[PDB]
Amino acid sequence: KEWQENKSWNAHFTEHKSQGVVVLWNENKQQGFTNNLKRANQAFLPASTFKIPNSLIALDLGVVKDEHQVFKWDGQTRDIATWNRDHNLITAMKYSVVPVYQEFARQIGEARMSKMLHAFDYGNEDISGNVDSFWLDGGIRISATEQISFLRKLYHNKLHVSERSQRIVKQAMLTEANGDYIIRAKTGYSTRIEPKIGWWVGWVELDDNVWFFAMNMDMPTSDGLGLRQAITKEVLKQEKIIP
Amino acid sequence: KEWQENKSWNAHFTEHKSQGVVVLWNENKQQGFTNNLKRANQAFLPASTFKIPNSLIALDLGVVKDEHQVFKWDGQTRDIATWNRDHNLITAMKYSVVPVYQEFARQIGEARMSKMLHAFDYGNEDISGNVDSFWLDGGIRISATEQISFLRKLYHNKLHVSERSQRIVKQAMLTEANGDYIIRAKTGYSTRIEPKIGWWVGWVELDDNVWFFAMNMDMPTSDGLGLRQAITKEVLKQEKIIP
Ligand SMILES: [Cl-]
């Protein structure tokens, strides 16, 4: 649980006229690195990163049966095109399809949702809002360092849900894989309360180690959204974690 | 019809100066495609493609605890540099580490191995030869279309082992992923009995379909190994399956 601040990464942000935080955790060595200890420990709305615990709970309670169950589009056209189609758990996570996840949350219900999040130690002690809204409207907050602590539990199958639920969600988090590395992760974009931010949280699997990461950054327009991944990958490259 | 022959792809073999087959299977439409209906049905030694059933059997019997268990290098240098290190199930499949897998076969034993392959309906189901080498220089043979038949059952969690064993092995088969597709697959190089061949078998996961593949090509020399993937992706691209 030992930490180093590297202000030198601030350059990856200033390059884009942005502000933000990257937090890395070396699993083998049990050491953390961040450009900004303060912001690393500040709590923000999780927006679509909340689909990770939402997925786990829906699977564990059998709200969702498996990763192939189809959730049919409701016929209402929303302004994100990829939402306007049938989804399973994999594609719902891939395209961050809020309406699907909102239906999951309703079936979970407020009482089980609250208890499972307490079991996960996820988020602030007193959450609030409606069950299908709280994770959007500002009823729950989490810091990049707290995202890492949660992801390390999931990695290790240590959360208070079945092993099966955790394996399925880790499959759903798969984002990139090559001969050098696998990334399992989830993006977020929080717009409903200031400051508007983007998220990318997850890990990098190597042959010999795993690097957990969580980043957030100011995101006043959707124009910068690609920086969530690019800035994280710049830091991974600089740190020789990926080529 | 159910099966369609597309000699068009033969051009990918000769443009890279070799010979072989590709079999594709459309899961949604239950349709098959190959450039050589004949060689598609021809049985060869599975070589390291046998790591898929071997892994499944090892996990299900508890010979292997999970994907993190470490198999320590014995300190003897072998031909392939990447073998000369510690491995877990994920790295052992990535690097095709025969020594690890032989140790599995010995602990499984001839009687359980034979029974399991009967229940998998795997190729000629014949394990005459060394229990720790039959897939390499022994009596077992399998066709590309029998590979696909087996791989379909694995995809659907319908092999006679636990769901957990199947999900772990499908994780271990992860070869490539991006915003376009996921490939789960395993390579094979058979050199001890003629004709020498290369395999690549697995599947391509898309948003709303899965394309199983099984391919084998002549490999008189280890210089063509790279072609196993290259010819398959050439075919995949031509069929508009991957960009
Ligand atoms: Cl996976």
Domain total for chain B?
1
Question: Is some CB atom of chain A closer than 8 A to the CB atom of B177?
Answer: yes
Displacement of CA B224 from its chain's centroid (Å): 17
Listed in sequence order, the DSSP H helices in A23-88 are: 37-40, 51-60
Which residues precede a break in chain B, with C-to-N distance above 2.5 Å? none
Residue A137: which domain range? 2-243
Kindly provide the b/e burial profile for residues A118-147, where b requires at least 16 CB atoms within 10 angstroms of the residue's own CB: eebebbeeebeeebbebbbeebbbbbbbbb
- The Cα A65–Cα A33 span in angstroms is 38
The two most distant CA atoms of chain B are separated, in Å, by 55
User: CA–CA separation, B228 vs B213, rounded Å?
Assistant: 12
CA B47 vs. chain centroid, Å, equals 8
Establish whether A128 is an annotated binding residue.
Answer: no
Burial B165-180 (b: 16+ CB within 10 A, else e): bbbbbbbbbbbbbeee
- The whole-angstrom separation of Cα B57 and Cα B101 is 11
Q: How many other C-beta atoms lie within 10 A of the C-beta of residue B41? A: 14
Question: What are the residues facing A186 on neighbouring strands?
Answer: A201
The CA–CA distances, whole Å, from B217 to A175, B10, B18, B174, B235 equal 31, 11, 7, 22, 14
Task: Report CA(B57)–ligand 1 centroid distance (Å).
Answer: 19
> Rounded to an integer, what is the distance from CA B208 to the centroid of its chain?
23
Question: Which residue type is seen at B167?
Answer: R
Q: What is the DSSP letter of A159?
A: S
- CA dist., res. A142 & res. A119, Å (int): 15
Question: Is B149 among the catalytic positions?
Answer: no
Using an 8 Å Cβ cutoff, are A131 and A113 in contact?
yes
State which residue of chain B sits closest to A92, comparing Cα positions: B207
Residue of B nearest to A162 (CA): B164
> Distance (Å, rounded) from C-alpha B236 to C-alpha B229?
10
Contact check, Cβ <8 Å, A176/B177: yes
User: What is the domain-level CATH number for residue A229?
Assistant: 3.40.710.10
Q: Does B208 touch chain A (CB under 8 A)?
A: yes
Closest-approach residue (CA) in chain A for B67 = A156
Question: Which residues are within 8 A (CB) of B137 and not within 5 positions of it... i.e. 6 or more apart?
Answer: B45, B129, B130, B192, B193
Residues forming beta bridges with residue A238, ordered by sequence position: none
Distance, CA of B54 to CA of B109 (rounded, Å): 11
A124/chain B closest Cα distance in angstroms: 32
Rounded Cα distance, A86 and A164, in Å: 24
- Residue A128 distance to chain B (closest CA, Å): 35
- Residue A96 labelled as part of a binding site: yes
Query: Closest Cα to residue B242, out of B201, B216, B199, B213?
Result: B213
Cα–Cα distance for residue pair B53/B61, rounded to 1 Å: 12
Instruction: Report, as residue numbers or ranges, the catalytic residues of A.
Output: 48
Residue B48 marked ligand-binding: yes
Q: Give CA–CA dist A168/A164, Å, rounded.
A: 6
Select from B240, B237, B236, B242 the least CA-distant residue to B22: B236
- Report the 10 Å Cβ neighbour count for B121: 13
Does A91 contact chain B (CB < 8 Å)? yes
What DSSP line would sit under A177-233, residue for residue? E-SS-EEEEEEEEE-SSSSPEEEEEEEEE-SS-EEEEEEEEE-SSGGGTTHHHHHHH
Instruction: Output the DSSP codes for chain B.
Output: --EEE-GGGHHHHHTTT--EEEEEEETTTTEEEES-TTGGG--B--GGGGHHHHHHHHHHHTSS--TT--B---S---SSGGGSS-B-HHHHHHTT-HHHHHHHHHHH-HHHHHHHHHHHT-TT----S-TTTHHHHSS--B-HHHHHHHHHHHHTT-SSS-HHHHHHHHHHTEEEE-SS-EEEEEEEEE-SSSSPEEEEEEEEEETTEEEEEEEEEE-SSGGGTTHHHHHHHHHHHHTTS--
Task: Show residues of chain A in contact with B84, CB under 8 Å.
Answer: none
Nearest to A47 by CA among A152, A198, A231: A198
Angle made by CA atoms A134, A138, A144, in degrees to the nearest 5: 105
State the angle between helix axes of B51-61 and B163-172 in degrees (0 to 180), rounded to the nearest 10: 140
Q: Are strands B197-206 and B209-218 parallel, antiparallel or unpaired?
A: antiparallel
Closest CA to B95 of B172, B154, B182, B167: B172
Query: Which pair of structure tokens corresponds to residue A157?
Result: 């199958």
Q: How far apart are CA B157 and CA A189, in angstroms?
A: 35
Q: Is B51 annotated as a binding residue?
A: yes
Contacts of B83 (CB under 8 A, 6+ apart): B73, B95, B97, B98, B99
Nearest to A71 by CA among A63, A79, A80: A63
Centroid of ligand 1 to alpha carbon of B220 (angstroms): 34
Q: Which of B48, B55, B143, B149 is catalytic?
A: B48
3-state helix, strand, coil in chain A (%, to 5): 40, 20, 40
Residues A182, B174: C-beta atoms closer than 8 Å: yes
* DSSP H or E stretch at residue A3: strand A2-5
Q: What's the rounded Cα separation, in Å, for the pair A122 and A143?
A: 10
- Taking the CA of residue A177 and the nearest CA in chain B, the distance in Å comes to 5
Method used experimentally: X-ray
Asked if B178's CB is within 8 angstroms of A176's CB, the reply is: yes
